[PDB]
Design a protein around this ligand. Structure first.
Ligand code: HEC
Ligand code: HEC
Lengths: 158, 160
């Protein structure tokens, strides 16, 4: 069973309950290390939908219907009782990508990339290839997903 | 009634948890070695999970029930620059640590919390910790019932 809800025009309605999907990794690009403004501010928490996670554990490939959600959060602080570093604050928004060779036959890897204007938006905004796919295609380790930063995925494949 | 996710020896020690990466993620932090004189206490990334049943109870109550298991999985820094910018990006897993709240199993421990370290991923069970090794620090600084929920935006968004 596929976890996206889509319009007929193949646009991803804003996902709900993605925090109960399978987390695959977190990174941080702080503003202070990026001319005070990282491109994607400031802690990517990444989830894959449960059905595609099951397929991933079995095959090491992204199924048709795969939905991946990246959730942005602020740096809330840089020192805590456990030491110095980066610690999360408040949520900032989400981005998503969907693999579907049937909905997106002309897109690279059959991936559609979605930006979201806000958490209250009813749907994502499909992106042209120059805005997202070009970088992912050039640099992601496996099928346009940056699996070099997802140790859960790497440990879960057969 | 929900499932129990923790398993215990006769001495009420938590056996090394499996499948916890399919529990509900509540937040991630990073304490890099390079920002702590080349020796972080807990290297480096921290990915934190709460078991699914206590998450269900949390969404309803904003409290940690008896039987709550939290797993902190440690990972290395894999890199410091990527196409998305500069910062910290994870590498490989380092180990795990856990805490279990249970008023019948641990009646005299602070907060009824048992803190567990793990010698390796292949170990049969955790090692229960003295109050001074872990509980003392958690008690001093955690926002709610010895869990550092100030760093778990999933929990804060999840309370009713
Ligand atoms: C256009 C607005 C987008 C959208 C919707 C997404 N990307 Fe990227 N991305 C980049 C890197 C280095 C990572 C992993 C490390 C990190 O977290 O910074 C990501 C991660 C994602 C994901 C998670 C799944 C994955 O493929 O890792 C998603 C869903 C996502 N992004 C959506 C790098 C870049 C870019 C290089 C400059 C560009 C441009 C984009 N991303 C653009 C977009
Ligand atoms: C003794 C070896 C332990 C064990 C088994 C754990 N701790 Fe800690 N802890 C501290 C801080 C500031 C945080 C949150 C920020 C961060 O990521 O560092 C934590 C978090 C945890 C968790 C997650 C659940 C939670 O309560 O937040 C777990 C399971 C955990 N730790 C295990 C601070 C400290 C200390 C002060 C220096 C000390 C000492 C410990 N922790 C010791 C332990």
């Amino acid at each position: 069973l596929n976890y996206g809800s889509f319009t007929k025009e193949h646009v991803l309605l804003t996902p709900k309950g993605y925090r109960e999907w399978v987390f695959i990794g977190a990174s941080v690009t702080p503003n202070e290390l990026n001319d005070d403004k990282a491109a994607f501010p400031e802690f990517h928490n990444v989830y894959i939908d449960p059905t595609s996670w099951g397929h991933w554990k079995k095959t090491g490939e992204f199924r048709d219907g795969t939905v991946i959600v990246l959730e942005l959060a602020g740096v809330g602080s840089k020192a805590s009782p456990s030491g110095n570093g980066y610690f999360p604050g408040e949520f900032n928004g989400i981005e998503a990508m969907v693999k579907d060779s049937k909905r997106y036959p002309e897109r690279p890897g059959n991936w559609a990339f979605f930006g979201f204007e806000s958490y209250e938006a009813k749907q994502g905004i499909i992106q042209t290839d120059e805005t997202c796919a070009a970088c992912h295609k050039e640099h992601a380790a496996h099928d346009m997903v940056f699996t070099q930063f997802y140790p859960v995925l790497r440990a879960g494949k057969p």
